[PDB]
């Protein structure tokens, strides 16, 4: 029901609004150069990384970076802090998903467990441009080279995230559309331990129709955006696929490396 | 354009029908479909094979289980052949798509170079069911169980592909439907090295359009099929990466076997 | 380039076969293995000894235990003679080796002058077993015991070769493996009195890269065989020195035997 | 896995680092004096020789040279003074290679028994440049020709060593590299009195895999640095025995010459 779909739509909107602070909307208004209430303090090298330690809030080893826990570490054990934060919001927005919180207790988790990372890169896009990506609330702009120049491992960590973002953003999906896309993802139903599935599908349908008319409407010209959009999902897989294989490395190679429970539990290889 | 979408959809059925031997139709009839006609022989256990292997139109090596390849190695080195074939089938077909042949020969090489697999794993499905799969012109039937009983690298090869058929075939798609879905696979347009993506997406779109109306007209009581059937290429793409991982792996596991040369080159890998 | 390697192998294999009539495959077909075909006349005692040459395919002297020469010596002398044929064999296989002839002869000789012995014990390793050693076209089999009961500086010369063997043999290597293994020795590059090592050193590396891919291939389950192998040019390097000890030790014995000249020459000592 | 491999090594390095004092790196500092910090005090003859006993703590005689003990013996003992200490480090280190102590006691010792020397000559290498060898905690220095003149025996009890050092050094391997090749050494598999080897073997294989990768990574240009480095494994033994056999002489030649607790036990011909 159209009238019920705009409802469904609009319904997921405010939620996304209330579960996530850095909307694509704000995150884009901190990337262009137009308004300069406060632009993003940019990070491109060490002098700046450090300079941004004072200018920006980085509750980590302020002075050196080498001998007392190298930086890539602090820069990596950083995302993992934002991380916890993501699943916080993410899960939250999932709580609001129509009928979602009804399904098997065991499954909801699964849904979150996986779809949480896939959703992390979905969002993440609106956070970056081909010059770099914003950090800590978009209160800063870490450059693409700064990262690219890092230690043998982590060094390739993000570089493979732009090609996706660049393209994903190229569809020009505003906020109003994201939430529902963030909705579908979650109600996938093709995950391990998926106890009872048809329901998660009945839901995902609700949100596949909804989201559908949202593109047509919100993007009259964006012919085939839906198909185009749903397609992106594969992109998001490999990325999550690959990412994992990294934490697969990193930890059995960084055994002092801690890991918050929500992550400890979603960080499940394969 | 409706009517035009109507004919495109037919255009492709015809050709597909002409470029493709074992269809989902005739397969079904044979598989889970009764039609107790010219039923196939079955392989349910290692010997049950040998004691059947001599009962079919193969072409390469006789039943030699000692210093002459083991079941495993011979069944895969058999897919390859068959795949190698359908490659041309998908090729001749591809040469029937509106505007295709008009593409640059490099992209035509590309479009085909990657989508072939996806095309393949999708069609393999018209021969699968939870229990097994058609073999040798579907003149036989390999069991998911039997197959499961094979050498270490090969054992869990189909198990996860089998899962796909489950979900893919769950859509109960008919040939006229696969006919376009398969056309979309060829002109995916995101492939590496395409030098003219404009047109490749121009056609494809006219195909997503053509597809949609199809899935509609023939499945009026099943919404989001299109959007479902679409959000399936990620499963395929997923498989694609597996094959090429469960394979590259075998490269440095069967190189000594440089007794493949001309047959090894006539095949290469895909 | 793996293609390059996979062939160098068969090339050298070929030549190992063409150059070396008796192989392991056979020194094994008649050794402990069965194939009960051309059973090797055994020598367990001094008594069987004399009763043997009157049947053994030897060419020169008869089992003259009528105050005509003495056994041990006689049984030793039969070795050095063998090795002389050996050298021919090996001196030929040498030619098969990539640009082994493009090197200054003031090295080619050396390489052979020094390697030869090693290649002599490496093959002997295949003619034995914890229980003995094949003799005369393997058309015979001297015991591990009988030889122990031999004269003062003789009844305890091979033991180490046996002690050795075992180990080596345990790599269940095949002549196709050994071909390449032999090659790598020849171009040992660390031979004293070398003139232009560069080329040599280069080749042996190619060889080393061929051998290495071999074991990886030929033997898929046994890592570090390659290493467990290069750890063997050492034992051989030792055993070789035995060959000297008894020799410069033999001088003080079989010497005044001036009814030898053009024979103690044809064989000299190496 | 390359993950578990780049780790063993990493572990194996600090070990080396925290066990063996003067490193190859710290050493190559001294030898290449483009610095001033604390240059060595070189001994090029008796003239100079009696000066190290001024700025250096030469635990040996300074007044008269022959009667109340001569110079060669006054050095040799000094050589084997490090020996006892050579024990320490490795012995200490030995207990760091995973699964070491986990072996049957006796067997443990064996690895130490013999391998205790090959490392020594391995570690002495980094100590010496074509022109000589550092001595006394890297402070003092003892020339080649200086030692090349000593009493009849010792006279050349180093010349051949240098050669090896000279040649070995050229592997341009560092401590990361060594530590492992030091681990592989101890972790033999062909020692006189090895009850249970499959284990020893299974352990080295591990160190050997680590090693392999380590060399690639660190020396991407260094073609075959592996095989080559393993080749040296032979070389080290020649010297060993030669030291072994010429340490004999000095024994029955100099009957009062003692052989501190440790040394004796790890000293045995054959
Ligand atoms: C070594 C490899 C580094 C990898 C990439 C670094 C950029 C990330 S991206 C951004 C948001 C986010 O994490 N995401 C998800 C994500 C997951 C995987 C990969 C990359 C990004 C998106 C998010 C934002 C907004 C809403 C929802 C979700 C952020 O604040 N980042 C964290 C860095 C903060 C600054 C810092 C620097 C130095 C120090 C110090 O000197 O100690 C301390 C702190
Ligand atoms: C060891 C691991 C592999 C396991 C899977 C095997 C199933 C296939 S399914 C069928 C068609 C096809 O080839 N495909 C290709 C494919 C398969 C698996 C994965 C990916 C792609 C499906 C297809 C049909 C139509 C069009 C496109 C593609 C077939 O003939 N099969 C091939 C085997 C024939 C039997 C045989 C056995 C031994 C011997 C002997 O040596 O003596 C003789 C005959
Ligand atoms: C004295 C101590 C014992 C020494 C070992 C004796 C057995 C050898 S082992 C074998 C191979 C070989 O020679 N080699 C060389 C080698 C082995 C060990 C050490 C040094 C050198 C290896 C070879 C084989 C294949 C290819 C290349 C090289 C062989 O034909 N043998 C030759 C002897 C035949 C018997 C005989 C005895 C007496 C009389 C009589 O009544 O007059 C006649 C015949
Ligand atoms: C006549 C025999 C000559 C033999 C070789 C001499 C060089 C050695 S090398 C070095 C340490 C070491 O032993 N090695 C190994 C070794 C083994 C075999 C041969 C040669 C060297 C290095 C090592 C350390 C720790 C671990 C592993 C390896 C050292 O301090 N050296 C000892 C001499 C110190 C100076 C000295 C001289 C004169 C006087 C006096 O007149 O008062 C007093 C002291």
Coordinates of N, CA, C and O in Angstrom, one line a residue, chain C residues 167 184 190 201 204-206 208-209 212 216 223-224 226-228 230-235 237-238, chain D residues 184 187-188 190 201 204-206 208-209 212 223-224 226-228 230-231 233-235 237-238 241:
Chain C
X167 N 68.3 -43.2 6.1 CA 67.9 -41.8 6.1 C 67.4 -41.3 4.8 O 66.2 -41.1 4.6
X184 N 71.9 -30.6 -9.6 CA 72.3 -29.6 -8.7 C 73.6 -29.8 -8.0 O 74.3 -28.8 -7.7
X190 N 80.9 -24.6 -5.6 CA 81.8 -24.3 -4.5 C 83.0 -25.3 -4.5 O 83.7 -25.5 -3.5
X201 N 77.0 -21.2 -10.6 CA 76.2 -20.8 -9.5 C 74.8 -20.5 -10.0 O 73.8 -20.8 -9.3
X204 N 72.9 -24.0 -11.1 CA 72.5 -24.7 -9.9 C 71.3 -24.1 -9.3 O 70.5 -24.8 -8.7
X205 N 71.2 -22.8 -9.4 CA 70.0 -22.1 -8.8 C 68.7 -22.5 -9.6 O 67.7 -22.7 -9.0
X206 N 68.9 -22.5 -10.9 CA 67.7 -22.8 -11.7 C 67.4 -24.3 -11.3 O 66.2 -24.6 -11.0
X208 N 68.1 -25.8 -8.6 CA 67.5 -25.7 -7.2 C 66.0 -25.3 -7.2 O 65.2 -25.8 -6.4
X209 N 65.6 -24.5 -8.2 CA 64.3 -24.0 -8.3 C 63.4 -25.1 -9.0 O 62.2 -25.0 -9.0
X212 N 63.1 -28.0 -6.1 CA 62.1 -27.4 -5.2 C 60.6 -27.5 -5.6 O 59.8 -27.8 -4.8
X216 N 57.6 -30.4 -4.0 CA 56.3 -29.7 -3.7 C 55.3 -30.5 -4.5 O 54.2 -30.8 -3.9
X223 N 56.4 -31.5 3.9 CA 57.0 -30.2 3.6 C 58.5 -30.2 4.0 O 58.9 -31.2 4.6
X224 N 59.2 -29.2 3.7 CA 60.6 -29.1 4.0 C 61.3 -30.4 3.5 O 62.2 -30.9 4.2
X226 N 62.6 -30.5 0.5 CA 63.6 -29.8 -0.2 C 64.8 -29.5 0.8 O 65.9 -29.9 0.5
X227 N 64.4 -28.9 1.9 CA 65.4 -28.6 2.9 C 66.0 -29.8 3.5 O 67.2 -29.9 3.7
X228 N 65.1 -30.8 3.8 CA 65.6 -32.1 4.4 C 66.5 -32.7 3.4 O 67.3 -33.6 3.8
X230 N 68.6 -30.8 0.9 CA 69.9 -30.0 0.9 C 70.7 -30.3 2.2 O 71.8 -29.9 2.2
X231 N 70.0 -30.8 3.2 CA 70.7 -31.2 4.4 C 71.5 -32.5 4.2 O 72.2 -33.0 5.1
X232 N 71.4 -33.0 3.0 CA 72.1 -34.3 2.7 C 73.4 -34.2 1.9 O 74.2 -35.1 1.8
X233 N 73.6 -33.1 1.2 CA 74.8 -32.9 0.4 C 76.0 -33.0 1.4 O 77.2 -33.0 1.0
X234 N 75.6 -33.0 2.7 CA 76.6 -33.0 3.8 C 77.1 -34.4 4.1 O 78.3 -34.7 4.1
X235 N 76.1 -35.3 4.4 CA 76.5 -36.7 4.7 C 77.3 -37.2 3.6 O 78.4 -37.7 3.8
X237 N 78.9 -35.6 1.5 CA 80.2 -34.9 1.5 C 81.1 -35.5 2.6 O 82.3 -35.4 2.5
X238 N 80.6 -36.2 3.5 CA 81.4 -36.9 4.6 C 81.8 -38.2 4.0 O 83.0 -38.5 3.9
Chain D
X184 N 67.1 -23.4 13.3 CA 67.0 -24.6 12.5 C 68.2 -25.5 12.8 O 68.1 -26.7 12.9
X187 N 67.8 -27.4 15.9 CA 66.7 -28.3 15.5 C 67.1 -29.2 14.4 O 66.4 -29.3 13.3
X188 N 68.2 -29.9 14.5 CA 68.7 -30.8 13.5 C 67.7 -31.9 13.3 O 66.5 -31.7 13.2
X190 N 69.4 -35.2 12.3 CA 70.5 -36.2 11.9 C 71.6 -36.1 12.9 O 72.7 -35.7 12.5
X201 N 62.2 -33.4 13.9 CA 61.9 -33.1 12.5 C 60.6 -32.2 12.3 O 60.7 -31.3 11.6
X204 N 61.6 -28.6 13.4 CA 62.4 -27.8 12.4 C 61.6 -27.5 11.2 O 61.6 -26.3 10.8
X205 N 60.9 -28.4 10.6 CA 60.1 -28.2 9.5 C 59.4 -26.9 9.7 O 59.3 -26.1 8.8
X206 N 59.0 -26.7 10.9 CA 58.3 -25.4 11.3 C 59.2 -24.3 11.2 O 58.9 -23.3 10.6
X208 N 61.8 -24.2 9.5 CA 62.3 -24.2 8.1 C 61.2 -23.5 7.2 O 61.6 -22.9 6.2
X209 N 60.0 -23.6 7.6 CA 59.0 -22.9 6.8 C 59.1 -21.4 7.1 O 59.2 -20.6 6.2
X212 N 62.1 -20.0 5.4 CA 61.9 -19.8 4.0 C 61.2 -18.4 3.7 O 61.8 -17.5 3.0
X223 N 67.9 -14.0 -4.8 CA 67.4 -15.2 -5.4 C 68.1 -16.5 -4.8 O 69.3 -16.5 -4.6
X224 N 67.2 -17.4 -4.4 CA 67.7 -18.7 -3.8 C 68.5 -18.5 -2.5 O 69.1 -19.5 -2.0
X226 N 67.8 -19.0 0.1 CA 67.4 -20.1 1.0 C 68.4 -21.2 0.8 O 69.3 -21.5 1.6
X227 N 68.2 -21.9 -0.4 CA 69.0 -23.1 -0.8 C 70.4 -22.7 -0.4 O 71.1 -23.4 0.3
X228 N 70.9 -21.6 -1.0 CA 72.2 -21.1 -0.8 C 72.5 -21.1 0.7 O 73.5 -21.8 1.1
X230 N 71.1 -22.6 3.0 CA 71.1 -24.0 3.6 C 72.4 -24.7 3.1 O 72.9 -25.5 3.9
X231 N 72.9 -24.3 1.9 CA 74.1 -25.0 1.5 C 75.2 -24.8 2.6 O 75.7 -25.8 3.1
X233 N 75.2 -24.9 5.3 CA 75.0 -25.8 6.4 C 76.1 -26.9 6.4 O 76.6 -27.4 7.4
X234 N 76.6 -27.2 5.2 CA 77.6 -28.2 5.0 C 78.9 -27.6 5.5 O 79.5 -28.0 6.5
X235 N 79.3 -26.5 4.7 CA 80.5 -25.7 5.1 C 80.8 -25.6 6.6 O 81.9 -26.0 7.0
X237 N 80.1 -27.5 9.0 CA 80.5 -28.8 9.5 C 82.0 -29.1 9.2 O 82.7 -29.6 10.1
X238 N 82.5 -28.8 8.0 CA 83.9 -29.1 7.7 C 84.7 -28.5 8.8 O 85.4 -29.2 9.5
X241 N 84.5 -30.2 12.3 CA 85.4 -31.3 12.4 C 86.9 -30.9 12.4 O 87.7 -31.4 13.3

